[PDB]
Amino acid sequence: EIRVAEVADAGVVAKLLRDFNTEFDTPVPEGLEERFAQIIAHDDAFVLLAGDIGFAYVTLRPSPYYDGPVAMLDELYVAPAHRNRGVGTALLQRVFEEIRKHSAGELQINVDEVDTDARRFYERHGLTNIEQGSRMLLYIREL
């Protein structure tokens, strides 16, 4: 039931991303569907879909530390009514399986500190916030 999205799946992915943003009261730009179609077709990136009820969006970017890329799980979402039944675990498992085909050297994920359920999920599935004895922070500037 997890599969790799094709270009023609961009509409379902965009709908799920819209739902994710709506759940968190964050507005979305126009054009999500068109942009996902281009990303899936041409870029060093992929989307995994669990039926039409969850997705994972992964980007691959270069690193001097590895022959392969660094992977980033830029979005992971399971629809609220389908949570706590193993869908997110299955998506994350498949993320690790797919990035291994690309010999990715590392997976990175940005998470809000307040999102303790997501944090617990990631910690229980092998991700850490600690490097060289310190927490790792994300700083941004929107442009």
- The site for ligand ACO (CB under 6 A) is made up of 73, 75-78, 83-89, 109, 111, 115, 117-118, 120-121, 124
* Residues making up the chain, counted from first to last: 143
CB neighbour class for 10 (10 Å; exposed up to 12, middle 13-18, buried from 19): buried
Nearest-angstrom CA–CA distance, 16 and 60: 21
Closer to ligand COA by CB, 32 or 91: give it. 91
Q: With binding defined as CB under 6 A, does residue 123 bind ligand COA?
A: no
Cβ-closest residue to ligand DVM?
24
Q: With binding defined as CB under 8 A, does residue 115 bind its own copies?
A: yes
> CB of 31: closest distance to its own copies in angstroms?
8
Q: Two tokens at 12?
A: 């379902």
Exposure on the CB side of residue 116, measured as CA atoms within 13 A: 0
Q: In this structure, how many other beta carbons lie within 10 angstroms of the beta carbon of residue 117?
A: 9
Residue 47: strand, helix, or coil: strand
CB neighbour class for 119 (10 Å; exposed up to 12, middle 13-18, buried from 19): middle
Residue in 63, 72, 58 with CA at minimum distance from that of residue 2: 58
Closer to ligand ACO by CB, 37 or 48: give it. 48
> CB of 111: closest distance to ligand ACO in angstroms?
5
Q: With binding defined as CB under 8 A, does residue 120 bind its own copies?
A: no
Site map 36..65 versus ligand DVM, x via CB under 6 A? -----------------------------x
Query: Which residues of this protein are in contact with ligand DVM, per CB under 6 A?
Result: 20-21, 24, 26, 65, 70, 73-76, 106, 109-112, 115, 131, 136, 140, 142
